[PDB]
């Protein structure tokens, strides 16, 4: 059984005559997040694509970091719209970045500034 990349993708077990699937398990690069050794030493580790305070991210599994529900402009980009920072003792937090504030404009058909 092959694919577009003409590499093995399936196989039939030759005793029970049933279909089996295959998948490699060697993905993932290792990355680390540091708020700067100038201030403190606590760090968090980020894996690239594997599935895993173990918190889960669209771009890997994050360990050593604490999730929050807020949103700010972010300091250290990570991936898939997730950013880490240090403001909080104090620790390392992750969240979804905020593109900025939001102000409506009082646009009326006779008002000028």
């Amino acid at each position: 059984g092959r694919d577009i990349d003409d590499t093995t993708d399936a196989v039939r077990d030759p005793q029970t005559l049933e279909i089996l699937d295959i998948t490699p398990c060697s993905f993932g690069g290792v990355s680390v997040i540091t708020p700067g050794t100038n201030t403190s030493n606590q760090v968090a580790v980020l894996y690239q694509g594997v599935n895993c305070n173990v918190f889960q991210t669209r771009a890997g599994c994050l360990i050593g970091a604490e999730h929050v529900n807020n949103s700010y402009e972010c300091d250290i980009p990570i991936g898939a719209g997730i950013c880490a920072s240090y403001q909080t003792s104090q620790s390392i937090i992750a969240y979804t970045m905020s593109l900025g504030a939001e102000n409506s404009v009082a646009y009326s058909n006779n008002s000028i500034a």
Partner: peptide, 16 residues
């Protein structure tokens, strides 16, 4: 498969 990881952009389409 053979060491061809693809990374996602750090700015998802919704933010764009």
């Amino acid at each position: 498969f053979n060491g061809l990881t693809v990374l996602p952009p750090l700015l998802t389409d919704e933010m764009i």
